[PDB]
Design a protein around this ligand. Sequence first.
Ligand SMILES: Cc1ccc(CN(C(=O)N[C@@H](CSCc2ccccc2)C(=O)O)C(=O)c2ccc(-c3ccccc3)cc2)cc1
Ligand SMILES: Cc1ccc(CN(C(=O)N[C@@H](CSCc2ccccc2)C(=O)O)C(=O)c2ccc(-c3ccccc3)cc2)cc1
Lengths: 145, 138
Amino acid sequence: PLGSMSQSNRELVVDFLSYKLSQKGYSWSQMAAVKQALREAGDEFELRYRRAFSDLTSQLHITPGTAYQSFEQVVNELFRDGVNWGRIVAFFSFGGALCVESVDKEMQVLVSRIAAWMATYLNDHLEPWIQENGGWDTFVELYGN
Amino acid sequence: QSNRELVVDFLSYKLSQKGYSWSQMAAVKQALREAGDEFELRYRRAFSDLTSQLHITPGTAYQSFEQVVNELFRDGVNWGRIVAFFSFGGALCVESVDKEMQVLVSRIAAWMATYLNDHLEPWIQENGGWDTFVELYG
Ligand SMILES: Cc1ccc(CN(C(=O)N[C@@H](CSCc2ccccc2)C(=O)O)C(=O)c2ccc(-c3ccccc3)cc2)cc1
Ligand SMILES: Cc1ccc(CN(C(=O)N[C@@H](CSCc2ccccc2)C(=O)O)C(=O)c2ccc(-c3ccccc3)cc2)cc1
């Protein structure tokens, strides 16, 4: 691809500057602040619930044949008693754990599939609640206090 | 706004924590961030002396940034100086936000891509590319 070098150089500059801004409580953009808050929230959730969380992640047996329906059914477990930001963070951590597992088990085909499942689940089931509850900007405020 | 952007960012981060690369640059990015932290902490005096060379205003253009950065590479190019160059750009961006000039962040990012492309990329490619930096500083 003719743009690879340009994309690589831009990705490197922006990654470095976003990191340095974030260390000072600033942001490259509002999206960069949401991303960073979600990275940290996912790390915090995973550190506090690791072993208990494997009771949820272990509910989905991933193969090259796994479709959206099976992912949706397991994720619906997080939202049976309703939606909140904590449950939303765990949903991202769930997707993250499946993605890592897919790569570990040489099923790299599932990375794209999992990313697509997450966007569909968010747009079909969580986006109406997110918008009614102040959007991602509110998540950043609440998480950061 | 974009849930796709948040999904990819989160998955790329979780992959990177396990030494897996969503993009080609993941190992390079990780090594550079950490080398930047190490330079700023271990050689904070050089870092502070470098940062103070450029007085940024709403009127600062590429030419002033390039003049200071040229002095950094006066004795030639090496990986340590490249690290300092990224730390220098980072420090100018933080200072711009401190002084209520967040707009200058995009200007600095554009200066850095131009300087890298025009002055540093030929040396980087002749010296084993960014993969060689990863082996040396990561
Ligand atoms: C960063 C972080 C995220 C989530 C949590 C945990 N948290 C939880 O404080 N809730 C709160 C919901 S609001 C929490 C919040 C507000 C704003 C931003 C981020 C988090 C509650 O029930 O009151 C959950 O909602 C939660 C979600 C899933 C599990 C779980 C599911 C399956 C198996 C094992 C564990 C266990 C707990 C802790 C820390
Ligand atoms: C206009 C201006 C330019 C430069 C400076 C400060 N200044 C710097 O005098 N540089 C010189 C001398 S410091 C060399 C050195 C330091 C530590 C270990 C080994 C060598 C250089 O890069 O030649 C650096 O910015 C600098 C750059 C890179 C490093 C470094 C980076 C990574 C690892 C080790 C050293 C260390 C220092 C201030 C103002």
